[PDB]
Symmetry: D2
């Protein structure tokens, strides 16, 4: 029907000259007590994969897709058929979408709702016969001209109302299709210039908005995990949920912290000047690592590139964080990635996903070994042991004060420290990377 | 004695060809209900001004200073004499210092304390005859090899003890000289690599450390304002108090929030990818704008340059934030700036400070007009008025929910927004800048 | 007709509360021996101003324009009428355009040519009754899907042919409408990944392409100035004419240097990690400062923002370079700027241009004073005078060698240098900025 | 004597739990027709390895080294003994140094020369019994206060003379010890501010300086390869030889191009916003890839970090460029890297170098396979074949013009392009990385 050239993609192993096969991702291979499929919980982004056109700030849409002949609802329906065909052939457990990705917006809200329901009906009775499930859905509060000054942070109370309606419908669809999570991304929730901005009001309203959401979620009995996806900027000059930490500060200020977890996207972390691992670590130690958008940016380019994950250091390092968190739990590895404008052929959708999946399979395999062999843990445990005994243990138990500490410091000679062993640790990481065979 | 060429610097007005005079900073000129001196509360950084040598990662110290002939305690004493001479000639209300700036460290802690006390005695009986007062002092927990793995975040509990002692002595000196504030800067409180880092432990300990400090402060009856100075990185690959917001998250997590306010440094804000104004705004709307380090970096250079503030847009924009905060209160405008390595002559210390002071005088003058003429406020007030009436007011009073908002959105036609008027606002800013005459 | 609200914009002076008037740009005010209009040679970018829609990588077109009701050729024609109305009301001497800005592309090249000719006929007989003239035009070799792998650097020789045709027609239109310059921008002339790139071939072909152009220009008797507009990246991961210097290297390698000059755009310079002034200076000292795209980016944002020039330090500093070059000569100050997505009203096109024009008027005024008062020149002349006499003069005349220099160095004691006086120079700049009254 | 713990480091293979052994670098393993040792031509940087102290812009020297007990010439001599011991134990073919690294500077030039000669005598009669040879030496024209305004670009002609003398002596030492290359790095050859800079003069003088050098080199009969090492900035706000391309432009302008080749350092390339491979590629296609400084920076940190190369993608990708250049020829892989301040123990010097050497061994191994299997070449050859036949071949032979190309374009339908296959190529790269076993 849509992808006729492509037959169902299978795991063929490392020594395999077949471009359309998994070299490392074996869905049922066990890594510890769970299979690769259970560990990785892969998900495809509806937006990039089925509605993306390869357009560029300086280029027109160039993507070649079979469903391009259609318009309107025919196109919406065509994409659903295509979507599920792609899911089956690639063997993906999950997918994600924004409301505007699946159905065309109407001239009035009532219309939008109609088109949406139609498409949701179609999606529901398809899930019926597919292994693929909805990881999370979300409301697109940034693309329409109406959200020009924000959504919940808009200076126009009508826009606040409209955004609320689209999130209300969003949660209903989530409940209906049994989404495991619901994602919020504040694309326009920031500022373009402080000069015309009442920041305290905007933040107050953003909090009021989120409160209303968690309330509605209870009322309809949603029970899926609420997620916030941080980003430093783009489109905005400054986006409010800049960081995992920055968003955390916000949630704490307004007492929304217990209702939320974070959706961390690699490209977003690097754009904030942090490493992907760093953002995962911070989320993790706060018990707020909700889910992951697995992509990769270019660190020499200051905008989102949404590339597929091929860098094995990143995947390894990310997986290490994820495994230590006890896994993704309710979230998954959603490929919020996009083929390069130069990879405009249909088969590139497959090449791209295989690349990302194999890269994460490798990362899972090695991150796991690093953990079971206590490669880094062995050392960390050894270098922090001063806090296990004597004065250190007093500091930790909370039985030390400036008096005792000063008294102690006074009898101290030259303090001796040991190496952080960075080059060694880095060398070790390489050795484990290369021991994938 | 030290600066013989230089006579006491006076305000001479705009049309004055004299390089050694204030063109805009008139200590007693009234701007609103306070004089420029009361508004600006200028302070000089002991470190850069009296101990800086113009060294460079690739260059040896090149600064030419009169007190260079001396060594050890003679040098420490010489600098104090020089310091107060400089304060008098420049007419500065305040100064700041790290413990290591004023006295040479000893081979043992007991020695360090002796040298410190000697110099503190000398400083105290000098304040006796000077208008200059101590804005804030601080403990240098980054320069010594002992702090290589952090101070309170060190993996060596002995280093935690040592840091605690130096902060204990720090607070005693603060109490003794009547410092208005006490600053903490976590130069080594971060990481060089996550690979060997137990982040949750380090953060836990940083919190335990700060708790012990606020406890000691109560015990000795300090009552000055505790300040935390954020920075994204340098020396560390990642410094924990990355941001005003990031540090806020930390303080909230450990319940230290009521004891602290922030010391915001321009170069640090830009290094985190924020504008100076932005950091002030965020601090301000949280009632945590404690004090300012008035410098300026180069946005094309990714390290701290600590230049003197000459950019008038920045000074204006910063002052606007400060005035809206109700002023600096207990803090001040500490010139944590440093002359360019090319400006190695003694007179450059004066040229530099005059430049920074005049620039802030201008900024104060125009920021004030912008505020009294309601230039930006007029507009902000107008564009957010939807939240004053009808549905908007319901949202704010907290009497709205997804139901009412959706009901409202359903009867809505095309939503109309108005321009953010950015170019206009920017044009206006220029007009006010140019109306300084 | 199109802008009914707006009446012809006039110079009203500094103290004028009228938003729709020039506060500093007085077309006929003399600054030295030329009027502001002759100095500034302002130009409007057809693309942003008449075809821009405010779309955003995450947002749909939101701009409100009177000619939006039209489609196809009606829209093309409508825009021409509108364009000239705007030119008249704003009093602009020049404009610029890409072929695709003025007429809709056809399904075949022959069609494209037809539509183009029609619109060119219309433009020509309009210039007939207008003061506005064509500064430069250019061929858009980046927007169409066909240029996905480059134009002259494309791996598809058919695309090379097509690009050549569009540049051929481009030069004919230039000759016909009497363009003063012709601009080349290599938007897709770079790479997305080195992995599939034969760089030496691409560069060889880029040179062959440019050679063919200067040859055709001679054949048809064009005689306008060829210009190359550098940019580091975006859309490309790396664009070949990265820099003024990088492009220079290229032109020198292939002997195209005498035929070209540079079109420098502020945002592009900052994106390459240079200051606007820097790029102008480099071009200038090589006699290759051809023309300017007067915009401004955000240094905290790593993509082109194309803002209107409001920063007065930049305009002053740029104008200083331009005046020292002996003026723009054949080029001009083309506003390759774009209103913020938040400034979506028609009147913002006017506010924006007024802002940019006044900002450059101010910059011209003060840059000129700096030059006539020899503010910086006085000093530069003094600090380099060692090369005027003795050994220095020998070095310059070329009568010195390592022998004499070593002999000299051997008899030298401690070398004495003097301050670079940076803070002083910066302070001075401010004083002149503020003396605009 | 110096490194007693450490015994001579040997190649032990991949499965080896010994931290002090090569896992991948086997000096005599053949890769193609040359052994790993002949291919890699490793070199150690005297400066970082023997004179580095781990100091930091905010930290004192913390490095622990056996020769620290000594001062003056005893220290200089001690380091030479240590240096050669290290070379032997690590089995390094080459080393590099700045004049100031090996001997202490005197109070007068005559003194400096004496100390230098003494140490050079010692080095010479040590090379006598060692396999290690001098890859290249250089003159340090940035560390001394005298070079504050540049060296050859200094505004003080006495400094130009002094720099010339130190370069003259530099070339004599090179000739004497048989250096294969001589490196120039313009650390202070740039500007801190354009405001006081006569750029054309500075550049003119830089060229005069380099001319005098190549002349002296001929006079004394040096015959080693002159190298220029580009860098964008640091210490300077802008360094003149910003880029490989920028430096190329300079050399072309002054006709120095035939005498020079480039020394490319990874961290410098990334700092200019280019990838390491990119800089090598550009140099390479111009026949100017002279030698390499093998380090690695952090792309989230905007200053030189000089880390040891552990990232295998980089080493692979760099080696691919080097192999295609026909190897390093006369240059080598000089570890201009430095241990992290946290790796302050003596044994870290070994861990660090092993890490870098193994990483490059791996890179050599896989880069070679990529080349022999024509992995990328196969594809590049296929996608550019339009330039082999028909119109394409005409373009290349130089028998095409705008007329023929337009005529051709006119008969063209829809142009068809094929995928750039980026994700595929990236996936392939991973497969080869993982096939190192
Ligand atoms: Mn993204
Ligand atoms: Mn995302
Ligand atoms: Mn600082
Ligand atoms: Mn500071
Ligand atoms: Mn642009
Ligand atoms: Mn442009
Ligand atoms: Mn370096
Ligand atoms: Mn180097």
């Amino acid at each position: 029907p849509y992808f006729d050239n492509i037959s169902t993609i299978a795991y063929e192993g490392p020594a395999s000259k077949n471009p359309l096969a998994f070299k490392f991702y074996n869905p049922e291979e066990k890594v510890g007590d769970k299979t690769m499929e259970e560990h990785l919980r892969f998900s495809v982004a509806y937006w990039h994969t089925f509605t993306g056109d390869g357009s560029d700030p300086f280029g027109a849409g160039n993507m070649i897709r079979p469903w391009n002949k259609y318009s309107g609802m025919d196109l919406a329906k065509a994409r659903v058929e295509a979507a599920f065909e792609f899911f089956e052939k690639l063997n993906i457990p999950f997918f994600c979408f924004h409301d505007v990705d699946i159905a065309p917006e109407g001239e009035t809200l009532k219309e939008t709702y109609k088109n949406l329901d139609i498409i949701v009906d179609m999606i529901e009775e398809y899930m019926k016969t597919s292994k693929t499930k909805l990881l999370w859905n979300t409301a697109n509060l940034f693309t329409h001209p109406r959200f020009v000054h924000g959504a919940a942070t808009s200076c126009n109370a009508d826009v606040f109302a409209y955004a609320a309606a689209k999130v209300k419908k969003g949660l209903e669809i989530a409940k209906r299709l049994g989404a495991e999570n619901y994602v919020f991304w504040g694309g326009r929730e920031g500022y373009e210039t402080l000069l015309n901005t009442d920041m305290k009001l905007e933040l107050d309203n953003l909090a009021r908005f989120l409160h209303m959401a968690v309330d509605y979620a209870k009322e309809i009995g949603f029970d899926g995990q609420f997620l916030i996806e941080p980003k430093p900027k783009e489109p905005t000059k400054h986006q409010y949920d800049f960081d995992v930490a920055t968003a955390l500060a916000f949630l704490q200020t307004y007492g929304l912290k217990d209702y939320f977890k974070f959706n961390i996207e690699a490209n977003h972390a690097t754009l904030a000047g942090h490493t992907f691992e760093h953002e995962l670590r911070v989320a993790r130690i706060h018990g707020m690592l909700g889910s992951v958008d697995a992509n990769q940016g270019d660190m020499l380019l200051g905008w989102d590139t949404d590339e597929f994950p091929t860098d094995l250091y990143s995947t390894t390092l990310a997986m290490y964080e994820i495994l230590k968190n006890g896994g993704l739990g309710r979230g998954g590895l959603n490929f919020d990635a996009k083929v390069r404008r130069g990879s405009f052929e249909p088969e590139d959708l497959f090449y791209a996903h295989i690349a990302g999946m194999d890269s994460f399979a490798v990362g899972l395999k090695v991150a796991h070994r690093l953990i079971e062999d206590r490669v880094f843990d062995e050392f960390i445990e050894e270098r922090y042991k001063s806090y296990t005994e004597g004065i250190g243990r007093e500091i930790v138990e909370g039985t030390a004060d400036f008096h005792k500490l000063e008294a102690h410091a006074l009898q101290l000679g030259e303090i001796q420290n040991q190496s952080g062993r960075q080059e060694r640790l880095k060398t070790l990481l390489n050795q484990y990377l290369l021991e994938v065979c």
